[PDB]
Amino acid sequence: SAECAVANELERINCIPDQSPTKATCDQRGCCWKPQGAISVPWCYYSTNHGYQVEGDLVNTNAGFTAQLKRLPSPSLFGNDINNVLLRAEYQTATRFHFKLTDQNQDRYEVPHEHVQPFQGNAASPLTYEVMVSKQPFSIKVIRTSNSRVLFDSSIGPLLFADQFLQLSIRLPSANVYGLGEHVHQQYRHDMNWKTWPIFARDTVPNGDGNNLYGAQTFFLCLEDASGLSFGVFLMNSNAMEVALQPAPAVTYRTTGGILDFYVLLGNTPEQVVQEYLQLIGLPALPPYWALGFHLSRYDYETLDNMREVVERNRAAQLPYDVQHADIDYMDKRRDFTYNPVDFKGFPELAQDLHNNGQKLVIIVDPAISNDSSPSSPYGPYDRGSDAKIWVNDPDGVTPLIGEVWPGKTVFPDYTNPKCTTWWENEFKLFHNQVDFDGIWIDMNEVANFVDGSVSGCSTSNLNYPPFTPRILDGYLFSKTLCMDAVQHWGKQYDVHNLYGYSMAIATAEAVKTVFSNKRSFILTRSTFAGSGKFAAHWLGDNAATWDDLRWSIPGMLEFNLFGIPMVGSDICGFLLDTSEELCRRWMQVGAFYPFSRNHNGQGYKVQDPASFGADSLLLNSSRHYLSIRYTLLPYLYTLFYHAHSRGDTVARPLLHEFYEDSNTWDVYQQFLWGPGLLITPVLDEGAEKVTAYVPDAVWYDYETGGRVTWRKQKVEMELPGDKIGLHLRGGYIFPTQQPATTTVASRQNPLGLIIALDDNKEAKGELFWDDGEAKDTVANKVYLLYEFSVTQNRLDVKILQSTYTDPNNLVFKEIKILGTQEPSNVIVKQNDIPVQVSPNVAYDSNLQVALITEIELELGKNYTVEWDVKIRDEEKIDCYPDETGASEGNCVARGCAWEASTSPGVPHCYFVDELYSVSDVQYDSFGATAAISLKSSLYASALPSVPVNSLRLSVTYHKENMLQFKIYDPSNNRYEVPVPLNVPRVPSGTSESRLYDVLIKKNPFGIEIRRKSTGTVIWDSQLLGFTFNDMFIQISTRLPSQYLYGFGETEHTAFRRNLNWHTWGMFSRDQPPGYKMNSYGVHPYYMALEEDGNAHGVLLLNSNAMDVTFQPLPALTYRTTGGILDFYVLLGPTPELVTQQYTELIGRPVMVPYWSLGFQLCRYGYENDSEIASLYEDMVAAQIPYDVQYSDIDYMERQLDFTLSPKFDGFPALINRMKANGMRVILILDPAISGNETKPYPPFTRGVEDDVFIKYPNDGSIVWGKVWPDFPDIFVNSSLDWDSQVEQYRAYVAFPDFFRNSTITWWKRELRELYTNPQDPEKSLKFDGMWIDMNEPSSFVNGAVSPGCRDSSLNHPPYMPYLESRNSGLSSKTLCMEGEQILPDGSRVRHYDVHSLYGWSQTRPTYEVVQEVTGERGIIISRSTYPSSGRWSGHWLGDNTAAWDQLRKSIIGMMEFSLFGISYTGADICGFFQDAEFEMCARWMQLGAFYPFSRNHNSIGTRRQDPVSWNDTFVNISRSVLETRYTLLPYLYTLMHMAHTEGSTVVRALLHEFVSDRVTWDLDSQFLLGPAFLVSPVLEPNARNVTAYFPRARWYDYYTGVDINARGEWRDLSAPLDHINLHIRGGYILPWQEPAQNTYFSRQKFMGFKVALDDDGTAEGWLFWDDGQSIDTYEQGLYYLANFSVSQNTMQSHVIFNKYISDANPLKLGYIEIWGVGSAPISSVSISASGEVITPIFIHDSATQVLNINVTNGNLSLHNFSSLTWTSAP
């Protein structure tokens, strides 16, 4: 039916909570029966026929509205249903709603709360909430206006309102619910899974059976979401009740009487909700200072002497101890207001003894008074009480009810009776006159009774046996308490039971006012109600000495802070059972940080006071150590109690109250805070020396050392030995301290101190409340000191806010401890701006960054300012004067910098001390962060090179889970941005949950911090001095995550890893032969860094302007650019390979090369004619040395003029065609510069002056003329002139095309199309297969332009010249003018000054496109000048090397660096370009060079021939051998290129890419990998016939023998004769290979094979990519073969991923399979499964070498038909 229509089984409200459900009761109650459901879900639920309806409308009133409600016709559940109910709502405050539901005709019981008085005000306006009332069925709804969230919804279930049964169900916005009490909940956040909690005060042990305990708390807090927005609910009802939780989420209150009186409290944070609640029920009492000390107690010390012995022992141990408790043993026969005259003779003297030692006495007092009084043995308390008629009475209202407790048969005082309060006061006065005690411990105030009801039992009434009972222990209300019909002043026990303890605390608080003189005392109670914390402290009851109770103590303590009873703790070491030393040790450690810290032992158990465990025990030493820490921090703790008392803050706090933005804190219950500042992490498990703890997102300092921890927003395993607890100070807070003593009396006479814990912005704040520590109402009477402390910019402000109290002890602040600071210097103290004559001492620990300032005397009660300067250590110094000339003390100071002529090499004399920019408007959004940066120091910014930029914007974008961008730019003016397109997501995906990183914007100074979320490692930190942003000078610095950095180019690095020891490297494209600290052909502002744990990241700066980078040993890196904006991209890894795959995804994946380009190549600068190339070709073929590509340098051209053919090369076209017919490929070189001095028709220049393609001067529009290769026509070029004379007399004037321009692109494609197919003579055509574009830096042999020269000196000689080669010659050195103008594709004008380093990049793509068009095949481009994204279309060679021995290792470093740059096709000129080759060097270089991806032997003009057929037959044999090896491996190499192209894997690989765990590989650059599996270990030294190589922890097989050298993690010297190169295959890999031939054309027709290298587990994996090796976009158009191959359990399987290339019509023939590491057992049989056929191949197994060779050449097997191969061993 539609009545039973409950959408969701989780929204069912249990209709039969009182018994097991049957369809019979569900039918009588008119509900809905459905036994379909999960566990714990109701089967009988309420219909919609149950509830009330609004009659009429909502009549409005002065405070809110009133509504009349009539009951809907439904069956009665428990009888006596109230038909007419009145709703009275009130808008008391902007953040406090109150509504009440009561009977309309009769008056019912309402809680007489002492603090909460009837509201008489009018409705508040505006409100932060809205209230909605539904008419039928009736429901109330409270909605937060700011976000329209429903906080409180009563529609989920019906309103039930009967005489002895009331119910209201509320749907909640979230499942984050806290509170409800008193119970052992076991966890802090509630389990909303069908759990019911009874609330009815009862004397019973807390044990985790979900029973009701000593108090009654109905308040709960709910955290809406991670904004902090929170609300609370409070029900003012004292009757017996239960609260049921359901997973909707919803809360149901079920009570046995009274009214429904609700308060809804709103707050922006959890703490504000608590504050609102406490302001309504009553703010907690401020305890006496001595009560914050440590307390000792036992039930049954037996005699006074035993008690004294305990006192003396603990004193002798010098344990911090201030209060002794006396339990019922001190009394006479367990009677109150008495002491035993025999066993406790001298009790008053004990009190005096404690006082003479600065200790206090707390005595116990029970509510029950012995009724045993006779004339012969009078008992005064009873007689006086009976005379006053102040007892709880039987139902007749006259006869005192008789119960039983400790003294036997007892009467119970009625504390709700005012006469009782007077009696109570008087009794305390008479006993205080006998024994001078300091505080009162009230117990058994539930009220407890050893019998049920009374000695005579309870009557059969509906009060003692109500129709509904709330799941209370034992199932009757009058169990171990009084009869429910018992009569008190406030009402029947049925209504006021839960108020008994509350009422007694009130009466006791009144007594204290009279007995103690103007002294706030201390009241400790067990039974509590809402508002009890205004009078008394609370303890969590009779726990047991178990690890569970230790664990449960923390959530209990946290809840009571919510309830407004912050002075709370559990019995340390357990009340019941004997404690172990370990348990008591780990409890004393955490117990030291309970707000109420007391050790309390039960009767008949082993002693457990700390000194009992022995004077040298670890427990005693540990207890003394952490109790001393507690005493040091009492001023801090006391101030927290002040905030609790004055405002309603929580003292012991949950982590979600401070860090609610992290959902990893919403359920933390094994850690807690004191206030906002002190994190406590205990060990709560037996035998544990480690804990898993959450460290929230803040700066944290180890309390004991003062050092900063590296944890932040991460789960950590904390090492906490038996004597250690986790204590951490939060940054941004100041902690008042006092030198500790054994008592609070003694400590308060000692000097004060400050701990200043600095945050990210280098700031902190604190407070200090200080009074007499004892007097009453010291806050309302305003007799106190209040200080506010603040630190900013190295200045401490000590400000008094209140000063009406004077301390008699002349206290002073003597020490200031600063955490997270640099060494303070020149400390100055002022008192109201007047200098104090003092010379403070500073002790500093540089390792911990902790400073101690002593010999200061800041008198308590006065205002002070303390200022200091900071000293910068040499390692943290940043060059303030990196300029080329003008360094001096004078010019340094003019920049606002500091000068120090230190001697340490590398350290700068002039360094920054101040910041130029400030940060503001820091906003953190879901997909990024933004901030405004504003110039503060205009004068000093203007002393640095170039004009400052005033306004800057910082934009952080979270692109992906592993990639982010941060940009700093000028929002007011468009500045140059690099026009190189990058690949970023269209919509951000760096979702907070998935992303691998966090970003933080810091102040003082401005800095961006990026952290790896998983380990908390900071990979980028710009919080260094030096940030400058001028028009032509921008500086930025970062701290490095370690000392391992790789990248930056292009230059000749000494090693693969950078030397971070004061070294500067310039970047600006230049024609410079590679050298030390010299800028070369390309620019790659990219680096990869290794973190100390082996995680890796990468950083790109997208800037093309001239720049340099500096490395300091901090470690730190600084970037200094001459223009542009700051545009950084960060890749998160975490692996070196994943970083490169991420980097290449951003900048573009490497180009797929043609198969023939992987063959060996020959070139020489200085071929005399076409016949010399023909002779070399024939000789190579004759010698059978494989080679695929022949090149020609600028010799085939007429006078080096581009797009011409020299007469000496008239036969070159025919030769090209002949070579091609035999399978050879030709690459030609093209230069960019075009001659303007031709007398005969020269189409290139004429058609380019017509199209306007050349770079011209900014405004006039003349061509910027340079000089490069073309000679003048009709002159005689003597070859005996020097280089300088030839450039001045023989070189023609040349014009440089602008390759950014559309017209230039069109003109360049036409010239190349006509070079391929000559439009005039169709015979002078040159049918090339690829192009070599050289001299594109652009390079000129003059500086700037032909003389007269350049024009704008401002751009050619810039304000800041980076550390470039020929630094004094300017940016125009060996290049074009910087004023030259270029035009982007969209028409925008740019200066050569901005785009110089993009010149080669801009030429590359057009060249690539035209080659693919004229040849119809993919082709290959090789450029000298490269920029990030250049590898998408071209390869790169490492430039003009020299024939020298050091150049072979430099080649290995260059190839590994270009692999990180995303250029896979690279190599060096084999045998050197400059100087004559030597035989041995050339032989070894041939062996190394055979494993370059780009493997070319190239030589300069003038030198001896260095090609393989130029030496002797020994060389021919070495060359042939190694090159045959190369051609065998081409399928493997080709597959690697495919993987680079498609996935962004690296081809040439440093060992650290595959073995990052071994730190030995972090410095290796003399060996390398091809892909993951092939290790190359060359000889790079002369005369050597051996090589020392490292073998990472893996199985490594000798390539030539198949035998595994056993070297796992070891160095090994390997034999390396002149005709040998050491090659090794890693186990676990399958390598495809093919039989070598003269060139790739013939080789591809031969048989293909597999080398299968098994790992230790006998497994291997590998890949094969195969296509036609030359067509365009074979993978994109789907004409290829791709397969993976695997071996396990002696079976090799083929898994074809894709195949539309290899077929029966086009077979790839499989011939050979070699399996290595098959074991020593003989191989009996080998079988191949192919095309549903079994082929038995020919096989040979060598048991000694463990190599199995399988030959399948006879079976005509094409690879696409191969399924699996299986081999079986001899048993």
Ligand X SMILES: C[C@H]1O[C@H](O[C@H]2[C@H](O)[C@@H](O)[C@@H](O[C@H]3[C@H](O)[C@@H](O)[C@@H](O[C@H]4[C@H](O)[C@@H](O)[C@H](O)O[C@@H]4CO)O[C@@H]3CO)O[C@@H]2CO)[C@H](O)[C@@H](O)[C@@H]1N[C@H]1C=C(CO)[C@@H](O)[C@H](O)[C@H]1O
Ligand Y SMILES: *[C@@H]1O[C@H](CO)[C@@H](O[C@@H]2O[C@H](CO)[C@@H](O)[C@H](O)[C@H]2NC(C)=O)[C@H](O)[C@H]1NC(C)=O
Ligand Z SMILES: *[C@@H]1O[C@H](CO[C@@H]2O[C@@H](C)[C@@H](O)[C@@H](O)[C@@H]2O)[C@@H](O[C@@H]2O[C@H](CO)[C@@H](O)[C@H](O)[C@H]2NC(C)=O)[C@H](O)[C@H]1NC(C)=O
Task: Please identify, using beta-carbon distances, which residue of 1480 and 1598 lies nearer to ligand Y.
Answer: 1480
Among 203, 649, 823, 1394, binds ligand X (CB under 6 A): 203
Peptide bond into 1137 cis (omega under 30): no
Among 1586, 1703, 1731, 1736, binds ligand Z (CB under 6 A): 1586
By the rule CB under 6 A, 328 interacts with ligand X: yes
Closest contact distance (angstroms) between CB of 1208 and ligand NAG is 20
Say if residue 1603 is exposed, middle or buried (CB neighbours under 10 Å; 0-12, 13-18, 19+): middle
Task: Choose the catalytic residue: 224, 336, 1009, 1440.
Answer: 1440
Which residues on neighbouring strands pair with residue 818, listed in sequence order? 756, 851
Using DSSP's 3-state secondary structure scheme, residue 834 falls into: strand
The CA-atom distances, in angstroms, between 1418 and each of 1401, 1412, 1415, 1674, 1720 are 19, 5, 8, 9, 48
Those residues whose C-beta lies under 8 Å from the C-beta of residue 349, and which sit 6 or more positions away, are: none
**Contact predicate 429/515, CB 8 Å:** yes
Residue 1513 contact partner, candidates ligand X, ligand NAG, ligand Z, none, CB within 5 to 8 A by sort of partner: ligand NAG
Rounded CA separation 362/436 (Å)? 10
Residue 371 contact partner, candidates ligand Y, ligand NAG, ligand X, none, CB within 5 to 8 A by sort of partner: ligand Y
- Active site (annotated) includes residue 1334: yes
Residue 205 contact partner, candidates ligand Z, ligand NAG, ligand X, none, CB within 5 to 8 A by sort of partner: ligand X
Go through 1703-1738 and write b for each residue having 16 or more CB atoms within 10 A of its CB, e for each that does not: eeeeebbbbbbbbbbbeeeebeebebbbeeeebebe
Q: In the stretch 426-445, what mask flags binding to ligand X with x, by CB under 6 A?
A: -----------------x--
Rounded CA separation 743/627 (Å)? 11
Among 1513, 1613, 1676, 1704, binds ligand NAG (CB under 6 A): 1513
- Active site (annotated) includes residue 876: no
Closest contact distance (angstroms) between CB of 1278 and ligand NAG is 4
CA 772 to chain centre: 46
By the rule CB under 6 A, 746 interacts with ligand X: no
Rounded CA separation 30/53 (Å)? 18
Helix (H) or strand (E) holding 1590: strand 1586-1591
Task: Choose the catalytic residue: 261, 414, 427, 443.
Answer: 443
Q: How many CA within 13 A on the CB side of residue 1359?
A: 17
Q: Which two tokens stand for residue 323?
A: 């209060």
- Best CA proximity match to 851, nearest among 819, 829, 813, 826: 819
CA 945 to chain centre: 38
By the rule CB under 6 A, 182 interacts with ligand X: no
How would you classify the pairing of strands 84-93 and 64-71? antiparallel
By the rule CB under 6 A, 1195 interacts with ligand X: no
By the rule CB under 6 A, 1172 interacts with ligand Z: yes
Rounded CA separation 321/48 (Å)? 62
Helix axes 1479-1489, 1513-1528, angle to 10 degrees: 10
1456 phi and psi, to 5 degrees? Answer: -70, -35
Task: Please identify, using beta-carbon distances, which residue of 413 and 541 lies nearer to ligand X.
Answer: 541
Rounded CA separation 658/575 (Å)? 33
- Active site (annotated) includes residue 163: no
By the rule CB under 6 A, 473 interacts with ligand X: no
Q: Which two tokens stand for residue 203?
A: 């004397």
> CB 350: neighbour CB atoms within 10 A?
19
Q: Is the dihedral of CA 297, 300, 304, 310 positive or negative?
A: negative
Only one residue has tokens 């207001």, namely 337
Residue 403 contact partner, candidates ligand X, ligand Y, ligand NAG, none, CB within 5 to 8 A by sort of partner: none
- Active site (annotated) includes residue 1337: yes
Instruction: Give the CA diameter of the chain.
Output: 149
Task: Please identify, using beta-carbon distances, which residue of 1364 and 1482 lies nearer to ligand Z.
Answer: 1482
Task: Choose the catalytic residue: 90, 203, 446, 771.
Answer: 446
Q: Which two tokens stand for residue 1528?
A: 């065998």
Task: Please identify, using beta-carbon distances, which residue of 546 and 1517 lies nearer to ligand NAG.
Answer: 1517
- Residue range at the interface with ligand Z (CB under 6 A); choices 35-43, 166-174, 862-870, 1165-1173: 1165-1173
How would you classify the pairing of strands 295-298 and 598-601? parallel
- Active site (annotated) includes residue 1021: no
Rounded CA separation 242/256 (Å)? 9
**Contact predicate 1721/1769, CB 8 Å:** yes
Amino acid present at 1576: V
Among 1278, 1677, 1706, 1754, binds ligand NAG (CB under 6 A): 1278
- Residue range at the interface with ligand NAG (CB under 6 A); choices 29-37, 74-82, 925-933, 1513-1521: 1513-1521
By the rule CB under 6 A, 1514 interacts with ligand NAG: yes
Task: Please identify, using beta-carbon distances, which residue of 578 and 1031 lies nearer to ligand X.
Answer: 578
Q: Which of residues 570-589 bind ligand X (CB under 6 A)?
A: 576-577
By the rule CB under 6 A, 446 interacts with ligand X: no
- Best CA proximity match to 545, nearest among 621, 623, 592, 608: 608
- Residue range at the interface with ligand Z (CB under 6 A); choices 881-889, 1168-1176, 1350-1358, 1416-1424: 1168-1176
Closest contact distance (angstroms) between CB of 346 and ligand X is 21
Peptide bond into 17 cis (omega under 30): no
- Residue range at the interface with ligand X (CB under 6 A); choices 539-547, 809-817, 955-963, 1602-1610: 539-547
Q: Which two tokens stand for residue 573?
A: 């070491």
Q: Which two tokens stand for residue 1043?
A: 């000392």
Residue 1280 contact partner, candidates ligand X, ligand Z, ligand NAG, none, CB within 5 to 8 A by sort of partner: ligand NAG
Task: Please identify, using beta-carbon distances, which residue of 538 and 1432 lies nearer to ligand X.
Answer: 538
Those residues whose C-beta lies under 8 Å from the C-beta of residue 1516, and which sit 6 or more positions away, are: 1183, 1185, 1508, 1509
Residue 1278 contact partner, candidates ligand Z, ligand NAG, ligand Y, none, CB within 5 to 8 A by sort of partner: ligand NAG
Q: Find the residue with minimal CB distance to ligand NAG.
A: 1513
Task: Please identify, using beta-carbon distances, which residue of 1017 and 1684 lies nearer to ligand Y.
Answer: 1684
By the rule CB under 6 A, 1386 interacts with ligand NAG: no
Task: Please identify, using beta-carbon distances, which residue of 1600 and 1611 lies nearer to ligand Z.
Answer: 1611
By the rule CB under 6 A, 1501 interacts with ligand Z: no
Task: Please identify, using beta-carbon distances, which residue of 301 and 703 lies nearer to ligand X.
Answer: 301
Among 187, 268, 279, 546, binds ligand X (CB under 6 A): 546
By the rule CB under 6 A, 1581 interacts with ligand Z: yes
Amino acid present at 1761: N
In the complex, which residues of this chain contact ligand Y (CB under 6 A)? 371-374, 402, 409, 455, 1479-1480, 1512-1514, 1618, 1661, 1684, 1686, 1695, 1697, 1738, 1751, 1753-1754
Task: Choose the catalytic residue: 242, 658, 1238, 1337.
Answer: 1337
The full 3-state SS of 1406-1450, as one line of letters, equals HHHHHHHHHHCCCCCEEECCCCCCHHHCCEEECCCCECCCHHHHH
Q: Is the dihedral of CA 1663, 1667, 1671, 1672 positive or negative?
A: negative
Q: Which of residues 1611-1670 bind ligand Z (CB under 6 A)?
A: 1613
Residue 364 contact partner, candidates ligand NAG, ligand Z, ligand X, none, CB within 5 to 8 A by sort of partner: ligand X
Residue 373 contact partner, candidates ligand Z, ligand Y, ligand NAG, none, CB within 5 to 8 A by sort of partner: ligand Y
- Residue range at the interface with ligand X (CB under 6 A); choices 538-546, 1087-1095, 1265-1273, 1442-1450: 538-546
Residue 1169 contact partner, candidates ligand Z, ligand X, ligand NAG, none, CB within 5 to 8 A by sort of partner: ligand Z
- Give the binding site for ligand Z (CB under 6 A): 1168-1169, 1171-1172, 1581, 1583-1584, 1586, 1613
- Give the binding site for ligand X (CB under 6 A): 203, 205, 207, 299, 327-328, 364, 443, 541-542, 544, 546, 576-577, 602
- The residues assigned a catalytic role are 443, 446, 1334, 1337, 1440
- Give the binding site for ligand NAG (CB under 6 A): 1278, 1280, 1513-1514, 1517
